[PDB]
Amino acid sequence: VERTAVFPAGRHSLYAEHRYSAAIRSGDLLFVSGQVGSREDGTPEPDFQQQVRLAFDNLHATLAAAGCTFDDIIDVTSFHTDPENQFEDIMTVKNEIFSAPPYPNWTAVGVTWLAGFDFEIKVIARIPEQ
Amino acid sequence: VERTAVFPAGRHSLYAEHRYSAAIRSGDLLFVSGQVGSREDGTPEPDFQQQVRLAFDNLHATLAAAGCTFDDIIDVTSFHTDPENQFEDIMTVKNEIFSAPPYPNWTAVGVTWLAGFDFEIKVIARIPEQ
Amino acid sequence: VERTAVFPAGRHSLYAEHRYSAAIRSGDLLFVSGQVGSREDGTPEPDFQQQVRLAFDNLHATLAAAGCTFDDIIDVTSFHTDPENQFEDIMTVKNEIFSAPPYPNWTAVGVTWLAGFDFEIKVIARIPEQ
Ligand SMILES: [Hg+2]
Ligand SMILES: [Hg+2]
Ligand SMILES: [Hg+2]
Asked: What is the fold of B1-130?
């Protein structure tokens, strides 16, 4: 009755292949699936920093589909396959995207697997119901 | 003033043993504790695919206690102790439960421990306040 | 338009150093960044049980900044670097803080990294908009 799926514009088949929605808009909240730096075919961008950038691009595209932007993000959780050797690269990209306060909150955790990817960002955004 | 606990019908003592609620209903949202394929005594179902199925059964039972069903799930996060050798089994079960779109969103992550279990699913569901 | 950051009273520079907010108040919900047992300089409390206690103290301080307390927590997720040898210590502290029902829900997961810490707690609290 409210379960409305949101998908990035264009063609991205991982959502079709694995059968899950890119995001779910429910009332005044948008719950986004973890985003990864994947190409149109579902494979990861080889270079790490590039994968992180692409992940953010895919995130933005998914947010756009709901009329959202990074400014509407109210909760952030990131997963890392090897956070130790990846944080400098991640911060470079994060400080480029989140340039000025109020900064988003954040929970970064080290995981053992991300379906072939090395970075993933799970986000929740507010969607005012007007 | 709003912190109302929700428990699956019947007797399941892991919540009593570890002292935590199966789910929390707050306003128009239901935050469910991660569900696992555990028997009444708190031990895991030995066979993997069976554990995943039981986990979903336990999830459904917890949702039912709040008047919810899988259709009310607005966010899904799953943890895996060895995602590589478990995804085919997991998809078999997921495609049986989530048979048709709109599919739920999803974030699957590889973890190192799940208190003896090999699969866990953390969910958030919408509970319209009428 | 709603993205309002919340910070624990006093001086804690990890939020400044890593550029992220301690919590985000959005409508009737407060999304708190994972809390860890860190000193004012950002380093962890050496003793485990002490780190867990400090983590809870830092959590309470962040909640206070929004006018919240542990009673307003509606969702709990904890990460552990070595859950096997840490659960007895964690429960000692949890049973001291969450002494009586309704207990909070809970999702505990084993992770590989937490930026030098061994325990982290990500929480969501309800903030009635009156
Ligand atoms: Hg929005
Ligand atoms: Hg419901
Ligand atoms: Hg509050």
From this structure: 60s Ribosomal Protein L30; Chain: A; (3.30.1330)
In angstroms, the Cα distances linking B35 to A56, B51, C69, C118 are: 30, 11, 26, 24
Method: X-ray
CA A59–ligand 1 middle distance (angstroms): 13
Alpha-carbon dihedral C4, C7, C13, C18, rounded to 10 degrees = -30
Torsion-angle region of C10 (φ positive above 0: left; ψ -120 to 50: alpha; else: beta) = left
A114 CB neighbours in chain B (<8 A) are 109-110
Which of A35, A111, A127 to mutate against chain B (most B CBs within 10 Å)? A111
In the block, tokens 């997963």 appear at A79
User: Is the CB of C42 inside 8 Å of chain A's CB atoms?
Assistant: no
Backbone angles phi, psi at A19, to 5 degrees: 55, 75
What's the CA gap between A8 and A107, in Å, rounded?
A: 24
Does A36 lie at the interface with B, CB-CB under 8 angstroms? no
The 3-state DSSP class for residue B81 equals: coil
In terms of CA atoms, which chain C residue is nearest residue A88?
Answer: C18
The alpha-helical segments, DSSP class H, found in B28-69 are 48-64
Structure's resolution in angstroms: 2.5
Burial of residue C81 (CB within 10 Å: 0-12, 13-18, 19+) is buried
Query: Given CB atoms, is A20 within the 8 Å cutoff of chain B?
Result: yes
**Subunit contact C18:A106, Cβ cutoff 8 A:** yes
Cis peptide before B101 (omega within 30 of 0): no
Is the Cβ–Cβ distance between C89 and C83 less than 8 Å?
no
Tell me if A20 sits within 8 A of B106, measured CB to CB.
yes
Instruction: Break chain C into its structural domains and give their ranges.
Output: 1-130
- Which helix (H) or strand (E) is C49 found in, with range? helix C48-64
C22, C65 Cβ separation under 8 angstroms: yes
